[PDB]
Homo-oligomer: 187 residues x 3
């Protein structure tokens, strides 16, 4: 009684080649291409296009540099004054919730998509995701990776190249691969 798209958003195994999901993706790719051309050439319509790609932004003025990639787009919800530098990728099979005043340096990747560890489940045509939640005033450094299901508290700083495999508390700098706490921000 659930559609594949229902299952996907729900964290449950779903069929990636479901006809609706497929059409959502070819649409996202098409719009993303227009968006990228718009931001690359500095056209004011980039916001109009972004605002049809992203599931939502708090101020309809998110700044995202080229070439952005996403799976669906509509699962991405960002707060006020969102900035993302060159070449960010967001696999938003599940919800990606980002707070206010967040900044991504170039090449930041956020994944909610994943697979089973075992070859048969994984090769079975089904797969699933775990939503990612990012707080307020989070600064993600260049090339960091935020794995599925991860949550990052407010005022956190992800160092460049960090592979964030576990939740990150408020007011910490984390770094490394896998990332660990390396400092506490004092207020």
């Amino acid at each position: 009684m659930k559609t594949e798209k229902d299952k996907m958003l729900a964290g449950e195994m779903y069929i990636a080649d479901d006809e609706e999901l497929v059409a959502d993706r070819v649409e996202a790719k098409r719009l993303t291409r227009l968006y990228n051309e718009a931001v690359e050439t500095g056209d004011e319509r980039r916001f109009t296009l972004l605002n049809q790609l992203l599931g939502s932004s708090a101020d309809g003025k998110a700044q995202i540099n080229p070439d952005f990639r996403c799976d669906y787009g509509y699962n991405i919800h960002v707060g006020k004054s969102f900035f993302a530098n060159f070449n960010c990728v967001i696999l938003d099979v599940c919800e990606v919730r980002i707070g206010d005043h967040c900044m991504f340096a170039p090449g930041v990747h956020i994944y909610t998509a994943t697979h089973p560890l075992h070859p048969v489940e994984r090769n079975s045509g089904k797969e699933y995701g775990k939503p990612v939640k990012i707080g307020n005033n989070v600064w993600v450094g260049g090339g960091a990776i935020i794995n599925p299901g991860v949550s990052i508290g407010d005022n956190a700083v992800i160092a460049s190249g960090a592979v964030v495999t576990k939740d990150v508390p408020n007011n910490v700098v984390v770094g490394g691969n896998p990332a660990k706490v390396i400092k506490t921000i004092e207020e």
Copy 2:
């Protein structure tokens, strides 16, 4: 024997050889067309890919934009190949990938490399080492797979992993440099 011959054989070759240069230029030119085909959703994406890749077991490899490669023709994939956004494959030597393999976004595979010593490195000659990836390998996002590496069946490469040496069957590797994190029981 041609510079292309030495290249495939893992020997020092002259990167600026006339034939190799034209190969690389054709590859870039066709890659742009392919990437546009995928981005716009045109079903001629497959025909293009099949002209670019060395071979595909089912002619139905699913590779998202923007794919980049050196030659293309040294890449051979099994069936149901999938690579997500922004994968890069430097196929100066053979890159052989099994069946049901999945690359997440931003996976890089390098067969190309250079001499550690300045003079040799700058001498206009380079070399490669082939990469072999078995069946049912899942490579996580932003993993790097170095020249010469082999990855055995059912291995999963964690996201961000820098895979500097061989990966046996049925393990999960992670980290930088990568190391075994757990074995898999299937």
Copy 3:
């Protein structure tokens, strides 16, 4: 003096990112980068003449940079002779990026001179800053390596693929890992 935000930025002082001159500079860099990338991708002979308008300087006007290259300003990037960068390198040149001769970047290398305050309020103040990056001669940066702001890399250094370079790197070493550590030295 008659000192602008751009002047503070170059000097490594806090600057207002959205200063109209700087904003317009970044917009120009993007338009030109898009042409450049198209020129190199399609194999056109004018790629060099375009690249020479983008970069601050090159020693020989013949730098080889594969698509899709990206940079903040372009004009803070100064390369020596025989520069090579493979696919998808990003350079944030808010401050100077000086690169010596015979350097080669593998795909996906990122050089950052841009950074931010660690505290949220200062970071959200519309102000930011940078620390310049200096890379010597005969440097090979392996694929996906990251050069952080303020880093110096000595002559003949080899950065392993995936290395995250957070501190100065001396002459004639191979470094690797996260954070990058010396693995071995290299002498000719």
